[PDB]
Amino acid sequence: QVQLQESGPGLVKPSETLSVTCSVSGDSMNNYYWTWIRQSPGKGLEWIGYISDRESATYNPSLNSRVVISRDTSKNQLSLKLNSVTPADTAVYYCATARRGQRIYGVVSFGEFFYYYSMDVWGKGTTVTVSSAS
Amino acid sequence: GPGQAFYATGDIIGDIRQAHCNVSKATWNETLGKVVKQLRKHFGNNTIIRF
Amino acid sequence: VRPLSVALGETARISCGRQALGSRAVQWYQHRPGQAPILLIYNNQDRPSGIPERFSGTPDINFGTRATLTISGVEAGDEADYYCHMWDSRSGFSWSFGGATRLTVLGQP
Amino acid sequence: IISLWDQSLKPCVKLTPLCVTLQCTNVTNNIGELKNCSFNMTTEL
Amino acid sequence: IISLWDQSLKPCVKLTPLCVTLQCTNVTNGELKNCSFNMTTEL
Ligand SMILES: *[C@@H]1O[C@H](CO)[C@@H](O[C@@H]2O[C@H](CO)[C@@H](O[C@@H]3O[C@H](CO)[C@@H](O)[C@H](O[C@H]4O[C@H](CO)[C@@H](O)[C@H](O)[C@@H]4O)[C@@H]3O)[C@H](O)[C@H]2NC(C)=O)[C@H](O)[C@H]1NC(C)=O
Ligand SMILES: *[C@@H]1O[C@H](CO)[C@@H](O[C@@H]2O[C@H](CO)[C@@H](O)[C@H](O)[C@H]2NC(C)=O)[C@H](O)[C@H]1NC(C)=O
Ligand SMILES: *[C@@H]1O[C@H](CO)[C@@H](O[C@@H]2O[C@H](CO)[C@@H](O)[C@H](O)[C@H]2NC(C)=O)[C@H](O)[C@H]1NC(C)=O
Ligand SMILES: *[C@@H]1O[C@H](CO)[C@@H](O[C@@H]2O[C@H](CO)[C@@H](O)[C@H](O)[C@H]2NC(C)=O)[C@H](O)[C@H]1NC(C)=O
Ligand SMILES: *[C@@H]1O[C@H](CO)[C@@H](O[C@@H]2O[C@H](CO)[C@@H](O)[C@H](O)[C@H]2NC(C)=O)[C@H](O)[C@H]1NC(C)=O
Ligand SMILES: *[C@@H]1O[C@H](CO)[C@@H](O)[C@H](O)[C@H]1NC(C)=O
Ligand SMILES: *[C@@H]1O[C@H](CO)[C@@H](O)[C@H](O)[C@H]1NC(C)=O
Ligand SMILES: *[C@@H]1O[C@H](CO)[C@@H](O)[C@H](O)[C@H]1NC(C)=O
């Protein structure tokens, strides 16, 4: 059971940093890849980006890269930091795996292929409110 | 123009790819062996030849 | 969003919005309202284990048919979100997951 | 062969109006050899 | 006859500039249309 526990403050004010973790258990952390996936009420699922073994966090052009994602191997958790929380950040934040799928339509010599990202196991998510309420 | 039309290129349907020529490596190697043999016979008897 | 009304039984066809510009590799998801979603069909033919046979993928013939999801004998468990995440080569990296469509089964005893 | 090729090319369509300012872009959405060129051309009229 | 017609049509005047938007109205009175249009002069 790879259960992706996530815990956040739950209360946040505009223009500050949000912190939600992604605890991994039941399976190792070097075998596969994990990412972050969110969802806003009234909108479809939104994706914070993806982090792979090389740790070069490929961020979201649709989120201005105003988000900070990382991971820690000691505590065995995936790290997501949301600095400068926008008032639109009232959303649920899941946690996702990342299968480095290979989709080749030509030859491999000429780079006539591309990688498609497959997701298999997802988390449960927590909802946060960004306002003066606390 | 009047009574004038040029055939342009339309959208390339499917993935954008490139023309490619496939030569069996074995056939090419064996034919290169035959040519290099005659080349060595033409130029001396047996000499270093780099294609 | 596209609310689809489908009678119980028989067959249902779910086609998504984005056109298959070039060869496509679609991903279909099941976002039940409230709980965590799952994946149904990937690589346009490969359906992962733990999925009922009532959902069949759409093989690619390099053209023609779009990214269609087939429902064979809908039941009470299919009231959820269908997501067409298509990796068309022409559109480059499919960073976006696309929109959302909802099926709301009618004629349900 | 030169004469035959030239003769078979004489009656076909001449492309002197193709010389024009080509406002041209790329076709590869992500990471040339395929240039989407938009330009002006004289129609029938 | 085809070849004769072709060869004699060659040296005479080509009318490629006649293709233009003919602003044409009904002649004073169909079968006859009074058209005013544009033409390139010597210059
Ligand atoms: C000459 O060049 C090389 C010499 O080794 C080699 O190229 C092959 O070209 C074909 C295309 O003509 C490639 O075909 C693809 O291979 C992948 C492999 O996973 C398939 O997935 C592709 O499937 C197609 O059809 C699917 C269903 O509609 C689509 O979803 C998909 O996008 C594709 O359109 C497709 O078959 C092939 O990979 C290469 N390389 C090899 C090793 O075969 C070939 O010998 C020659 N190529 C020619 C004659 O085009
Ligand atoms: C090259 O550019 C043209 C013009 O943008 C593309 O054709 C148009 O595409 C739009 C959609 O993006 C259509 O609404 C138009 O009807 C198309 N034609 C015209 C006359 O504008 C064309 O697809 C591009 N080619 C490639 C391969 O990128
Ligand atoms: C084709 O002809 C049109 C005629 O209008 C050109 O349009 C103008 O282009 C300039 C830039 O070159 C713009 O500043 C104008 O506003 C355009 N006018 C209109 C009404 O669109 C167009 O540029 C020409 N294209 C080419 C390739 O030369
Ligand atoms: C076709 O139209 C032309 C232009 O209106 C006519 O010629 C002109 O007729 C006016 C009188 O209506 C004269 O004052 C002009 O001098 C004429 N020529 C020019 C250069 O305008 C012409 O007669 C019309 N043909 C018919 C048969 O209707
Ligand atoms: C020949 O070319 C002239 C170029 O100006 C055309 O003149 C214009 O015609 C439109 C109607 O088609 C008028 O609204 C403009 O005011 C005209 N401009 C001027 C400066 O006169 C003329 O129409 C063309 N010939 C024909 C018969 O269409
Ligand atoms: C060329 O194509 C034919 C089939 O048309 C095939 O039998 C042959 O092996 C091909 N040759 C190479 C070198 O791929
Ligand atoms: C696109 O056009 C630019 C010039 O505007 C050119 O330098 C470039 O090579 C073209 N192709 C790509 C892949 O960017
Ligand atoms: C005017 O011209 C048109 C051209 O089609 C013709 O049909 C019509 O009979 C003419 N006269 C009138 C009175 O409209």
Give the C-alpha separation, D40 to D27, whole Å: 19
Q: Within 10 Å of residue E39's Cβ, how many Cβ atoms? A: 7
Tell me if C46 sits within 8 A of C54, measured CB to CB. Answer: no
Taking the CA of residue E23 as reference, the ligand 5 atom at the shortest distance is 27
Question: What distance in Å separates residue A75's CA from the closest CA in chain C?
Answer: 24
| Contact indicator for A91, A39 with CB cutoff of 8 Å | yes
**Cβ neighbours for A84, distance < 8 A, ≥ 6 positions apart:** A15, A16, A17, A66
User: Which method, experimentally, gave rise to this model?
Assistant: cryo-EM
The whole-angstrom separation of Cα A98 and Cα A120 is 7
Distance between CA C44 and CA A103 in Å, rounded? 11
Indicate left, alpha or beta for C11 from its phi (over 0: left) and psi (-120 to 50: alpha).
beta
Determine the atom of ligand 5 nearest the C-alpha atom of E36. Answer: 27
Angle A101-A103-A107 (CA atoms, 0-180°, nearest 5)? 135
Give how far B16 is from chain A: nearest CA, Å: 9
Resolution (angstroms) equals 4.2
Which residues from A are below 8 Å from C83, CB to CB? 44-45
